[PDB]
Structures are given as structure tokens and as C-alpha cells.
Design a protein around this ligand. Structure first.
Ligand SMILES: CC(C)C[C@H](NC(=O)OCc1ccccc1)C(=O)N[C@H](C=O)C[C@@H]1CCNC1=O
Ligand SMILES: CC(C)C[C@H](NC(=O)OCc1ccccc1)C(=O)N[C@H](C=O)C[C@@H]1CCNC1=O
Lengths: 302, 302
């Protein structure tokens, strides 16, 4: 028993992390087969990041402008092209540590692990969710661009995120591995703001089930509600509305605890109207929304 | 910027995890050079765990009673001995993925990463602290014994924890890698309880500094206090007393923010007397004590 913010083991990804230098700008790249993927703003100087023309900036470079280091080994760039907001650097050597992988775009509310890296060197791993406003609440310093987010599906690494930038509110924005931004953001140092965030309701319910599984039951009650009555009050507190797909997704957790989904919604509805009043749930005094139903099952059943 | 519960990258440890089977009991082992380390209760049947005599149980086994699997490969046990609460299985093959390592015993209040494993297979990584009562608030299911806790110091893995058992309160207990338990616990299925836990004060202060570094300043005030006045009120709320060593350890964070340690203690003293009143700090509505001063520096400066 117990419940922790748990990330995927990062070994398979650590072997793909490289350092990419172009000019006086160094950041991280992802080396899979004979391609290195990295954020395209590695080709910008400090002055270019204000209003860059990446097509111009790229035509003025040659393969030898790109320094790629995999630990102690230098990799020879033999070709380069731009795909949306990423750079694809073709290199002479295929990465022998290339895992089975795919590129997936995730949806708001889903979670993934982040391997934070500096100078091509893995520094830490943590778990986060893609917010409904397409930002992530990450932990990133200067030099972290090119760090990647991933899930592991059996023996297959699903890459879903490459880090690019921090917004003025201190939250983080990036792309999928095809270079398409999550959210309405661009890779230039302009003033862009995220839209308003909402709480991921299906994830809160999943976490309440994790609490029951671990012996926290004080918030339960005998009432029930309907999808429409719940959604009416959820709107008022900035909670995502709940659908029948969500209810179905919570099925396994309903079965294991014998508490129906709409039963648990009545508890949630009560917690929203009255608060926790100095009580905690799984060691927290706020409602946690960064665990999916699948995360809970994975941790509370295996 | 940002602040997350961040674990060390686990790749170097994933390569040392093996499956150890003896009888109908399977758990995890740690394979370094030509020794596999695992909890000694792998030699117990379901009936033996109530009052085991491990010296008797061990003399009745031979090397071939021990099935050791490193993925698909079987390892031949060529010798076995018991060191306190661990088993040392000598095998014919040295682990080629053996990192630079050492065995260290940590102190209450210090943090480490845990690689949770099942059947020799790494399942997840998370960060925790050794509590003042020598338990950890982990997340572990049946089959997790032999999972290890570690820190990474440059290129060197410091192993500090091997998991053995869950106590009735749902918290976890284990040994260092020499087989000596943390806390007054024994590896038999008796009724043992942890002593009362306290809050790790130096860690709370470190986290308040992380909050200031990230722009949360609402709890600051102009007062100051002395070590003795602070410690007087801290005792009443079950907080560890604060020493001059702690003050010195918080120096780098005091320097970076321009707020003296005893200045921040007055803020803490205020938060203990009055609470947060619906405000949060770094996304939490409780005071967090599982980040050391070193964790904060590592994440907020690099
Ligand atoms: C998209 C390009 C214009 C470059 C990008 N811009 C950007 O974040 O500007 C706003 C900003 C700048 C500096 C500090 C705090 C906020 C940029 O600096 N990326 C960094 C590259 O490693 C990563 C950033 C650095 C802080 N944490 C991160 O995640
Ligand atoms: C020290 C020996 C007697 C064996 C040990 N005893 C023990 O925890 O009994 C109390 C108990 C038992 C079952 C379930 C919940 C609580 C034991 O079962 N270890 C398990 C070996 O993988 C790991 C445990 C299992 C739950 N989570 C863990 O961390």
C-alpha cells in the first residue's frame, strides 16, 4: 500500500540523450537510429529569439555548424532538415541503445514522465499532467530545452513531449515529437499567455478511489447524484465536465471498491461545497488532479 | 523555474535488478560484480515468516535451491552466505553493467530515490525521505521486497536502502545494504509499531526558501526570532528542534534570497500558530518536509 507521485524508470531514455551545440547555444537532443531531434531555436543567437525567421536562419548554416556530443563521443552531422518546430539532424552513427519507440500526441488530462536534462546529461525524473490549457507545471531551468516527456508501454517508449520554453507565469510549453506545439504557442520570445486552467475532474475521482483503496474513507456518504446535477455544480468551481466515457473509464476502480462512480461524485460534490475542514486525503489538503485512472490502477493493483 | 518532487534518473540501477526465486517465494535482488544481494526472508515459506530461525533455514538449502534470473538469462549460484538481514548470493558471472557504487547508511531527514520493482522488473521511481521514526512513506505492493533506494553522486551510485516489509500503519521498513535495519524492526511477521513521527524542520525551512525563489512571498514578515524562542514553539507542534548546524546548512539559500535563517523561522513560527487560511505555498496547503536543503539547491540553481 501507499501512494506516491511515481514516474516511469528512465533508463531507456537516458541512452538517447545528447548535447547539441550550434554557435554559443547548447541544449539537449534526442538520438534515435541515425537522427537527432532537438528544438529548432538552437540555431538562434540571443538576438534572433525576438523575431526569428527560421527558414532564413537555417539556410545560412551547414552541417559543420552543429556540434553533437553523446557523452565523450562526437557525432558527425551528415544532413539537416526542419520539421515544424523541431530540427532533424541526420548523423553518421545509428544509436545502438535505440529502444522500441513511437511518437504519440497526448490529450489534456493525460500524464507522462519528464527526464530533465542539461548539456545532454540526465538530471532528474518527475511525473506531470498535460493541463487543459496545454501547458505543463514542470520544473525547468535555463538549458533544459530538448528534455523529453514519455510513457512506457510494456517494452515500448512512447515519446509525447519535447520541452521548448517557459511562459511568464512560470509554466512550461513544448511540442510533440513531430514539432507541433501543444497549445496556441510559438517559439519566439514574445508575450504569450496561457488560457485559464481548469481542474481535471476524472483524475480527482480516480484519486479519491486511490484514497479509499488505501483506507481514507471519511469523505464518503450515502447520497448519489446524476451526471447532470454533478456537472452543474462542477462548472461553478472550474472543474471539467464529466462524461459517460469518464464514468466507464472509472469502472475498474468502482468494481474494486464497490463504490459506484455517481456515488463518489456525490462525495466530490460535498467536498467542493464544504471543503476539507482541516482533514487530509492521502497526505494532501487539496484535491489532486494529476493521476489518471490508469495511474491509480497501475499503482494500487499493478 | 517550478518545483517538483524529483527523483534521480534510474538507468544505472535498472541494470542491476534481478529476480530471485527460492521455493515458491520470488522477490528482487541487486546484482553488483558477482554478488546478488536480496532480503533473507526469500528463504521462508508462508509458514516460516511467523517465527523464523534463519540460521536453521539457511543450512537446509543448497546453491541450487536459488533461482536467479537477469531478464532472460539464468545466473548460476556458486555460493551463499548471510550478512545480518540480507542474503549474499555469489554467482558465476560478474554484472557487466555494474556502476561505480558504494553502500551508505543515511540519517533521518535525508532523501533518496526508490526504484520499485516486481519480479526483477523495474516498475516506477519516486522520491522519499527517511522519517525521524526510521520508516519511509513508500508505495509498495506484494513482491516489492529487494527494491532499493539510492542517491547519485556525480557518477557514483550510493545505495542506502533495501525494502523488506510493510508495517500495520501502511508505512515501510527496510535495511541498509549491509543488512542492518533502519529503526527497531525485525524481519518476522510479528506486531511491531513505529514510534511517533515528527516533522523535519530544517526541510520545511528549505522548502519555504524554494517558495521564495519561485515567487511565493505572502508568508514573509519583518520579525525575527532566536533559536531558543523558535525551538520552544516548535516542540509544541511536534517539530524537530533546530540547531546551528541546520542554520549553517541553510546558508546558501539564505544568501541567494537575502532572507536570514532566523528571519524565515519567524515566518514559520507564524504559520504554525495561525495556519495558512486557505492560501497555498508551491501548490500545497500543508508544510512540506521531504526536500532537503541540497534538494532545493539542486533544483533551484542546478
Ligand atoms: C522559445 C525561445 C524564445 C527560447 C525560450 N524562451 C523563453 O522561455 O523565454 C521566457 C523565459 C526566458 C528565460 C527565463 C525564464 C523565461 C528559452 O529561453 N528556453 C530555454 C532553453 O533552454 C528554457 C527555459 C528557460 C527557463 N526555463 C525554461 O524552460
Ligand atoms: C518480513 C517478512 C515477514 C515478510 C513481509 N511482511 C510484511 O510486510 O507483513 C505485513 C504485511 C503483509 C502483507 C501485506 C501487508 C502487510 C512481507 O510480506 N513483505 C513483502 C515482500 O515482498 C512486501 C510487503 C507486502 C505489502 N507491501 C510490502 O512492502
Amino acid at each position: 500500500s501507499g501512494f506516491r507521485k511515481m514516474a516511469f524508470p528512465s533508463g531507456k531514455v537516458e541512452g538517447c540523450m545528447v548535447q547539441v551545440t550550434c554557435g554559443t547555444t547548447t541544449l539537449n537532443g534526442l538520438w534515435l537510429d541515425d537522427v537527432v531531434y532537438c528544438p529548432r531555436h538552437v540555431i538562434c543567437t540571443s538576438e534572433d529569439m525576438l523575431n526569428p525567421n527560421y527558414e532564413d536562419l537555417l539556410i545560412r548554416k551547414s552541417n559543420h555548424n552543429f556540434l553533437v556530443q553523446a557523452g565523450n563521443v562526437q557525432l558527425r552531422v551528415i544532413g539537416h532538415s526542419m520539421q515544424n518546430c523541431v530540427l532533424k539532424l541526420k548523423v553518421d552513427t545509428a544509436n545502438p541503445k535505440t529502444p522500441k519507440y513511437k511518437f504519440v500526441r497526448i490529450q489534456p488530462g493525460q500524464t507522462f514522465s519528464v527526464l530533465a536534462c542539461y548539456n545532454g546529461s540526465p538530471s532528474g525524473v518527475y511525473q506531470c499532467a498535460m493541463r487543459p490549457n496545454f501547458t505543463i507545471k514542470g520544473s525547468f531551468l535555463n538549458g533544459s530545452a530538448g528534455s523529453v516527456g514519455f510513457n512506457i508501454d510494456y517494452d515500448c517508449v512512447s515519446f509525447c513531449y519535447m520541452h521548448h520554453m517557459e511562459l511568464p507565469t512560470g509554466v512550461h510549453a513544448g511540442t510533440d515529437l513531430e514539432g507541433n506545439f501543444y497549445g496556441p504557442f510559438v517559439d519566439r520570445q514574445t508575450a504569450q499567455a496561457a488560457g485559464t486552467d481548469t481542474t481535471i475532474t476524472v483524475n480527482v475521482l480516480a484519486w479519491l478511489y486511490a484514497a479509499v483503496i488505501n483506507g481514507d474513507r471519511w469523505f464518503l456518504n450515502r447520497f448519489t447524484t446524476t451526471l447532470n446535477d454533478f456537472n452543474l455544480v462542477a462548472m461553478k468551481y472550474n472543474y471539467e465536465p464529466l462524461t459517460q466515457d469518464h464514468v466507464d473509464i472509472l469502472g475498474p476502480l468502482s468494481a474494486q471498491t464497490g463504490i459506484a462512480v455517481l456515488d463518489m461524485c456525490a462525495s466530490l460534490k460535498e467536498l467542493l461545497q464544504n471543503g476539507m475542514n482541516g482533514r487530509t486525503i492521502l497526505g494532501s489538503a487539496l484535491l489532486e488532479d494529476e493521476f489518471t485512472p490508469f495511474d491509480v490502477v497501475r499503482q494500487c493493483s499493478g
